[PDB]
């Protein structure tokens, strides 16, 4: 895949390694969404929550989906498209997750739900783009949401999805 795909992926592995060495909480203290308004101008935090992973399983499952769906968007729609999808979903899915359950969360799966959402609807409305998501998967992405409802970031997942559908919509009617 392409530069944005690999970069991200180097970013996540670097940050995971540091969590192994320093501990989750010490990376959390610097990379998590601000828990205190005093911290509101530490602008990296609105994005960096997305680099943190909490087990080998967390990271591998996330990078897998990210490489498959992010690689597809980068190659058919270009590097800038992946950046924008990434920055908006990371910002908005953090925002909603922080309201639902507080600032202590991380992982790329909010961005990934946006990628799932964007790839599916865009595959539906503009087959000419040459991206698509198999049916078997959105329904799965839907059933991963109900088990999280009953320790998943549930607001990150639905807000990510919403951002994905919206942008795809706005991108297809164009």
Q: What residues act catalytically?
A: 109, 157
Residue 69 DSSP label: I
Six token digits for residue 60:
């591998």
Please give the radius of gyration of the chain, using alpha carbons only, rounded to the nearest integer. Answer: 16
Nearest CB to other proteins, comparing residues 4 and 111: 111
Q: Which is nearer to other proteins, 101 or 129 (CB)?
A: 101
For residue 171, what are its two tokens? 């991108």
Q: Which residue has the tokens 């998943």?
A: 152
Separation of alpha carbons 34 and 131, rounded Å: 36
Which stretches of the chain bind other proteins, using CB under 8 A?
24, 28, 49-50, 53-54, 58, 93, 97, 101, 104-110, 144, 148, 151-154, 156-157, 160
- Identify the three-state secondary structure at position 126: coil
Cβ closest to other proteins, residue 160 vs residue 164: 160
CA atoms of 116 and 160, how far apart (whole Å): 9
């Amino acid at each position: 895949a392409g530069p944005v795909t690999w970069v991200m992926m180097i970013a996540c592995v670097v940050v995971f390694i540091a969590m192994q060495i320093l501990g989750d909480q010490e990376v959390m203290l610097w990379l998590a969404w601000p828990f205190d308004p005093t911290l509101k101008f530490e602008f990296w935090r609105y994005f960096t929550h997305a680099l943190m992973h909490f087990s080998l399983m967390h990271i591998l499952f996330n990078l897998l989906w990210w490489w498959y769906l992010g690689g597809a968007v980068e190659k058919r729609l270009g590097s800038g498209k992946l950046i924008v999808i990434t920055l908006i979903s990371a910002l908005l899915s953090g925002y909603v997750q922080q309201k639902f359950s507080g600032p202590w969360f991380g992982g790329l799966s909010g961005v990934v739900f946006a990628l799932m959402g964007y790839v599916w609807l865009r595959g539906e409305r503009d087959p000419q783009s040459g991206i698509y998501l198999q049916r078997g998967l959105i329904i799965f992405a839907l059933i991963w949401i109900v088990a999280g409802w009953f320790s998943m970031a549930n607001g990150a997942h639905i807000a990510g999805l919403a951002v994905g559908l919206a942008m795809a919509f706005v991108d297809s009617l164009n």
